Amino acid sequence: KRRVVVTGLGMLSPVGNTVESTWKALLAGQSGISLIDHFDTSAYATKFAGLVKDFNCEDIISRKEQRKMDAFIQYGIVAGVQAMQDSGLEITEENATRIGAAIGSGIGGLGLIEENHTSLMNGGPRKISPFFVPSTIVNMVAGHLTIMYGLRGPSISIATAATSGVHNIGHAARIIAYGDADVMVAGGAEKASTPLGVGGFGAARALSTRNDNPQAASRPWDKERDGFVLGDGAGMLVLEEYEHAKKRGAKIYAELVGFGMSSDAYHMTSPPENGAGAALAMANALRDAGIEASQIGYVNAHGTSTPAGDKAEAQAVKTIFGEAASRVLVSSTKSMTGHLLGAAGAVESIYSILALRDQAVPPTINLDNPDEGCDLDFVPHEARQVSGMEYTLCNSFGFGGTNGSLIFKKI
Amino acid sequence: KRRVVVTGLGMLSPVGNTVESTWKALLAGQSGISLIDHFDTSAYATKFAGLVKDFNCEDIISRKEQRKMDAFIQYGIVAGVQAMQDSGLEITEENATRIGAAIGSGIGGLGLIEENHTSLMNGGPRKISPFFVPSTIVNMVAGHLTIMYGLRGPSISIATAATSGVHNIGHAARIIAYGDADVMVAGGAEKASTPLGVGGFGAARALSTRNDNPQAASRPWDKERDGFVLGDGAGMLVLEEYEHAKKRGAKIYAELVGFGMSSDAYHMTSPPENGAGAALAMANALRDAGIEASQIGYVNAHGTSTPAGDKAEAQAVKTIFGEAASRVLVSSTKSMTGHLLGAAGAVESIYSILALRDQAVPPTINLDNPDEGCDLDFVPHEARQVSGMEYTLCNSFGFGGTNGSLIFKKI
Numbered sequence: 001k002r003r004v005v006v007t008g009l010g011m012l013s014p015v016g017n018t019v020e021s022t023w024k025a026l027l028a029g030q031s032g033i034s035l036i037d038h039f040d041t042s043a044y045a046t047k048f049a050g051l052v053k054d055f056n057c058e059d060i061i062s063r064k065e066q067r068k069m070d071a072f073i074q075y076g077i078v079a080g081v082q083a084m085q086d087s088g089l090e091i092t093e094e095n096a097t098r099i100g101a102a103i104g105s106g107i108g109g110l111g112l113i114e115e116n117h118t119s120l121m122n123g124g125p126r127k128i129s130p131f132f133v134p135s136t137i138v139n140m141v142a143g144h145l146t147i148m149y150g151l152r153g154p155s156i157s158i159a160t161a162a163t164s165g166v167h168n169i170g171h172a173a174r175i176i177a178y179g180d181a182d183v184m185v186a187g188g189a190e191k192a193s194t195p196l197g198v199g200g201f202g203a204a205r206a207l208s209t210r211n212d213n214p215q216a217a218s219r220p221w222d223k224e225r226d227g228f229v230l231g232d233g234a235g236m237l238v239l240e241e242y243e244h245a246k247k248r249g250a251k252i253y254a255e256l257v258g259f260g261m262s263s264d265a266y267h268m269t270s271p272p273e274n275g276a277g278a279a280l281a282m283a284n285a286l287r288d289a290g291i292e293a294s295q296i297g298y299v300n301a302h303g304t305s306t307p308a309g310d311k312a313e314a315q316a317v318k319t320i321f322g323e324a325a326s327r328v329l330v331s332s333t334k335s336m337t338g339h340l341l342g343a344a345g346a347v348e349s350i351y352s353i354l355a356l357r358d359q360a361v362p363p364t365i366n367l368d369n370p371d372e373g374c375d376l377d378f379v380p381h382e383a384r385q386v387s388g389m390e391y392t393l394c395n396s397f398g399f400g401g402t403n404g405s406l407i408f409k410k411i
Numbered sequence: 412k413r414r415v416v417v418t419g420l421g422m423l424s425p426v427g428n429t430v431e432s433t434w435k436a437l438l439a440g441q442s443g444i445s446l447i448d449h450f451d452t453s454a455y456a457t458k459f460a461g462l463v464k465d466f467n468c469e470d471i472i473s474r475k476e477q478r479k480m481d482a483f484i485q486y487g488i489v490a491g492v493q494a495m496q497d498s499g500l501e502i503t504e505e506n507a508t509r510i511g512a513a514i515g516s517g518i519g520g521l522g523l524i525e526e527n528h529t530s531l532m533n534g535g536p537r538k539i540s541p542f543f544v545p546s547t548i549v550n551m552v553a554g555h556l557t558i559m560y561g562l563r564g565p566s567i568s569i570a571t572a573a574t575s576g577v578h579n580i581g582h583a584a585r586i587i588a589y590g591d592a593d594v595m596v597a598g599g600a601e602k603a604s605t606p607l608g609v610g611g612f613g614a615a616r617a618l619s620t621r622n623d624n625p626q627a628a629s630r631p632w633d634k635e636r637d638g639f640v641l642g643d644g645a646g647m648l649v650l651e652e653y654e655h656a657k658k659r660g661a662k663i664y665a666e667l668v669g670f671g672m673s674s675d676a677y678h679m680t681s682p683p684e685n686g687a688g689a690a691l692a693m694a695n696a697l698r699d700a701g702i703e704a705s706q707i708g709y710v711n712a713h714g715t716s717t718p719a720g721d722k723a724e725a726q727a728v729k730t731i732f733g734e735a736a737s738r739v740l741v742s743s744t745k746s747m748t749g750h751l752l753g754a755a756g757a758v759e760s761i762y763s764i765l766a767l768r769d770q771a772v773p774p775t776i777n778l779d780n781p782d783e784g785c786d787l788d789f790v791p792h793e794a795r796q797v798s799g800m801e802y803t804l805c806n807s808f809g810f811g812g813t814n815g816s817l818i819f820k821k822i
């Protein structure tokens with residue numbers, strides 16, 4: 001029976017360009033949201049997002065390679081290198097075949113799709129870049145990282161909108177446990193802060209339009225919430241079979257013990273009031289880990305700051321946790337980071353792991369006036385110290401009603 | 412130990428709008444390639460593709476729902492309904508939670524991305540459709556089908572370019588065998604015959620430009636080949652745990668016994684001359700099925716009709732099959748159908764299954780003058796009768812060097 005642990009972490013987020021700088025900012029309640037300046041937002045209903053500040057890949061991706069990739073792939077590669085370096089793993093001819101990748105994105109290369117389509121509109125197909133396809137498609141982060149590191153093992157890329165990060169991490173674990181690999185770099189990357197991304201989610205009436213106070217816009221469970229805040233970045237974890245990790249003296253952050261999935265089978269862009277799908281994903285994760293809901297100390301919620309989405313998840317938590325519901329801590333880090341879409345579940349699994357390490361839980365900031373009739377502890381405003389927390393649970397849900405939950409265990 | 416069988420099939424292809432009509436055409440050596448007429452190809456180097464003829468969804472997708480989906484999602488839904496209906500499965504409140512979907516696409520909703528981007532360019536973000544996101548993203552076929560059928564089990568969508576079909580089918584099987592589901596509808600759908608699709612792959616110098624003879628363009632292993640031919644369509648399989656299938660008296664087409672994966676770790680859009688990645692995927696699939704290469708009767712190749720790609724796979728087959736290499740039959744149905752990208756591995760797994768049922772193998776048409784120095788039997792020109800074939804193997808490789816192989820067993 002093969003156990004899977006986490007031995008490396010990598011991350012770029014709106015609140016930090018490393019894992020520790022991001023975590024420090026989150027525990028401190030800092031918002032990473034700001035006004036967009038890279039495109040003219042005059043005509044846009046939403047004019048702000050969680051942007052990666054001063055992204056730097058100079059020493060990581062060559063000048064020749066950079067021009068062949070959309071920003072999301074650049075972010076994914078940088079975060080992936082961080083994780084691989086953090087793991088201390090040394091790739092060999094003997095090892096190569098047993099190390100792979102499971103990395104996705106919800107929307108992929110919007111910036112370069114826009115660039116190529118603009119070129120086509122202005123000057124015909126002759127103006128499309130030879131790199132159009134490999135520079136925009138979802139599986140290109142996995143492609144570059146395997147080439148960069150000489151990884152010959154399984155490589156997949158799950159694209160399930162906001163559920164991607166969790167699905168990719170979960171299936172990388174399954175792949176290891178099944179015996180198809182001993183190591184997998186897994187996660188997600190996204191850079192959807194573009195005219196189509198902002199304009200597209202805006203057309204769906206899904207984004208907050210609180211332009212006059214961007215840092216207060218993302219407010220999960222707060223009565224004045226008005227939609228999600230788009231965030232960019234990437235999160236990557238090196239997952240590794242347990243005995244393999246011990247034998248090389250790897251540093252072990254936590255163990256991945258449960259992975260649950262479900263489908264709402266309700267509506268393409270909204271959950272059912274019941275939160276029944278969210279509940280089933282959590283229950284499935286608990287059963288997979290062989291534990292009871294009461295053993296979870298902290299839930300890093302999907303909690304995007306939408307009127308209906310936040311309510312459905314609160315109902316699902318009440319359902320699964322029953323009597324214990326008020327004793328579990330639940331928080332949405334998207335209150336600070338915004339919604340990283342395909343990378344959300346990746347960066348959030350990292351938060352769920354660090355909460356175990358530090359026995360500290362980041363707050364849901366901006367929760368001034370919570371919805372009435374709910375007794376859950378959403379950790380409003382300020383980080384919380386926890387005591388003997390052994391398990392954390394990370395939820396990530398996506399358009400199409402696809403749900404995923406992961407459970408991490410301390411040590 | 413949970414075995415997985417195939418109990419339902421669904422398909423739209425350039426040679427037929429049903430599973431049996433497509434198969435009949437393939438065994439007959441008919442090409443499904445024709446000149447494009449839905450957009451002006453004057454400026455395009457490639458002016459032909461494998462198009463779905465007279466696609467009809469009138470009785471399957473409502474008028475209200477049709478306008479919310481790119482053509483690839485429409486194709487995926489129709490094919491998925493065909494498979495679900497073919498399976499005879501009845502969904503119940505008791506069952507719902509154990510039935511899911513693993514369906515992807517390589518590029519997704521190009522037609523609607525182009526439409527929305529054109530609108531944005533012409534009239535600003537206000538002209539973007541509220542449906543932009545849910546109408547184009549890869550996981551939307553799985554989303555619609557789960558809603559349509561009331562499926563509450565696991566839903567994922569793997570987007571690994573041309574490897575998608577095989578990865579999705581393979582991981583749906585893993586999900587069932589793991590115990591997370593008893594049934595999964597799996598496959599892929601694609602409609603990349605658009606200005607960005609044709610112009611994009613054309614910019615990469617990846618497509619055949621034999622405009623004067625479209626039906627002869629796709630010619631895997633032939634000395635005059637000059638790139639792949641884009642094809643549209645969808646393939647779906649209902650996979651089901653064995654005992655569950657028997658208990659309901661399901662019709663069983665074949666059993667899925669092996670799934671192998673690998674990464675080339677060589678180049679973003681080309682395989683290594685060695686074909687080492689392709690070889691490792693096949694070897695991994697053989698090991699997973701617990702069989703030897705000599706037991707495979709037929710390989711449905713990735714064989715896209717590119718100079719370097721076709722050569723690498725022939726080398727990989729020689730490597731894995733050794734002495735037996737000339738005894739195994741290898742064919743590329745893309746010689747007739749064109750390359751269905753994210754749906755290629757799905758429709759091709761269907762062909763690999765029907766070959767077992769009918770003990771007949773479709774030809775690699777157009778193979779007039781094969782590359783020198785290779786003794787493989789590529790089944791040129793004409794279908795072949797086989798005798799006691801018990802296993803078939805389907806290869807599907809993708810940009811980013813991601814490889815996948817599936818092995819089907821008769822009965």
Ligand SMILES: C[C@@]12O[C@]34C[C@@]13C[C@@]1(C=CC(=O)[C@@](C)(CCC(=O)Nc3c(O)ccc(C(=O)O)c3O)[C@H]14)[C@H]2O
Pocket residue numbers: 162204205206227228268269270271304306307308309310339397398399400401
């Ligand atoms: C048709 C509607 O769907 C949306 C476009 C609208 C108008 C809206 C009404 C209330 C709402 O609260 C939402 C804003 C979002 C629901 C949600 O939270 N949807 C949702 C989901 O179901 C899964 C994932 C995410 C994610 O952001 O990852 C997500 O936002 C809306 C509904 O009328």
Ligand SMILES: C[C@@]12O[C@]34C[C@@]13C[C@@]1(C=CC(=O)[C@@](C)(CCC(=O)Nc3c(O)ccc(C(=O)O)c3O)[C@H]14)[C@H]2O
Pocket residue numbers: 573615616617638639679680681682715717718719720721750808809810811812
């Ligand atoms: C840089 C190049 O990469 C491509 C754009 C070019 C110019 C080209 C030269 C020779 C070639 O034969 C290819 C045409 C395709 C290789 C291939 O077969 N590539 C390939 C692959 O590695 C995996 C999947 C697929 C698929 O079509 O699914 C695929 O075509 C070219 C190389 O210089």
